[PDB]
């Protein structure tokens, strides 16, 4: 969906779109999608653009441009969501968390997890590293 | 005193025998 982004990327993206829009229609050419992304720091090579117009005629409207930035931002955020989700598990932050620490903080997180689900969770996997916890979460 | 030695050997054998003796796919992106 598009609720993954806050207000403040969307108000910035309409700021970039209405700056280089042609006549206020909400239209840009297949050149201007390149210059509107390099105006904000993001510098993709032309293969990254080449698939998105194939994924959406020559008229790139503002809901089409908003959906392409949402997929361009969510893939790196879905790859990096899980490390900061791992940070409250260990006290130091290198990735090493105790097994005795993990049965009171993971049964109390608010998804109605009982004592039985985290007991299945850790014995289908001392202290375990960080990259194994992605290996055991995504499965 | 053979009964005490047999009871101690039986207790040692019993102690040696005693010593020798999911979630859904969206809940895992939810719990993360």
UniProtKB/Swiss-Prot annotation, chain A:
Ca(2+) 3 binds at residues 90, 92, 94, 96, 101. It is found in: Cytoplasm, Cytoskeleton, Spindle; Cytoplasm, Cytoskeleton, Spindle pole; Cytoplasm, Cytoskeleton, Microtubule organizing center, Centrosome; Cell projection, Cilium, Flagellum. There is a cross-link at residue 22 (Glycyl lysine isopeptide (Lys-Gly) (interchain with G-Cter in ubiquitin)). The modification Phosphothreonine is found at residues 45, 107. It comes from the Eukaryota. Homotetramer. Interacts with MYO1C, MYO5A and RRAD. Interacts with MYO10. Interacts with CEP97, CCP110, TTN/titin and SRY. Interacts with USP6; the interaction is calcium dependent. Interacts with CDK5RAP2. Interacts with SCN5A. Interacts with RYR1. Interacts with FCHO1. Interacts with MIP in a 1:2 stoichiometry; the interaction with the cytoplasmic domains from two MIP subunits promotes MIP water channel closure. Interacts with ORAI1; this may play a role in the regulation of ORAI1-mediated calcium transport. Interacts with IQCF1. Interacts with SYT7. (Microbial infection) Interacts with Rubella virus protease/methyltransferase p150. This is Calmodulin-1. It comes from Homo sapiens.
From Swiss-Prot, chain B:
It is found in: Sarcoplasmic reticulum membrane. Detected in skeletal muscle (at protein level). Fast- or slow-twitch skeletal muscle. The N-terminus is blocked. Channel activity is modulated by phosphorylation. Homotetramer. Can also form heterotetramers with RYR2. Identified in a complex composed of RYR1, PDE4D, PKA, FKBP1A and protein phosphatase 1 (PP1). Repeated very high-level exercise decreases interaction with PDE4D and protein phosphatase 1 (PP1). Interacts with CALM; CALM with bound calcium inhibits the RYR1 channel activity. Interacts with S100A1. Interacts with FKBP1A; this stabilizes the closed conformation of the channel. Interacts with CACNA1S; interaction with CACNA1S is important for activation of the RYR1 channel. Interacts with CACNB1. The calcium release channel activity resides in the C-terminal region while the remaining part of the protein constitutes the 'foot' structure spanning the junctional gap between the sarcoplasmic reticulum (SR) and the T-tubule. Pore opening is mediated via the cytoplasmic calcium-binding domains that mediate a small rotation of the channel-forming transmembrane regions that then leads to channel opening. Cytosolic calcium-activated calcium channel that mediates the release of Ca(2+) from the sarcoplasmic reticulum into the cytosol and thereby plays a key role in triggering muscle contraction following depolarization of T-tubules. Repeated very high-level exercise increases the open probability of the channel and leads to Ca(2+) leaking into the cytoplasm. Can also mediate the release of Ca(2+) from intracellular stores in neurons, and may thereby promote prolonged Ca(2+) signaling in the brain. Required for normal embryonic development of muscle fibers and skeletal muscle. Belongs to the ryanodine receptor (TC 1.A.3.1) family. RYR1 subfamily. Binding of [3H]ryanodine indicates that the heterozygous channel is activated by Ca(2+) concentrations 4-fold lower than normal. Single-cell analysis of cotransfected cells shows a significantly increased resting cytoplasmic Ca(2+) level and a significantly reduced luminal Ca(2+) level. This is Ryanodine receptor 1. The chain holds residues 3623 to 3633 of 5037 of the full protein.
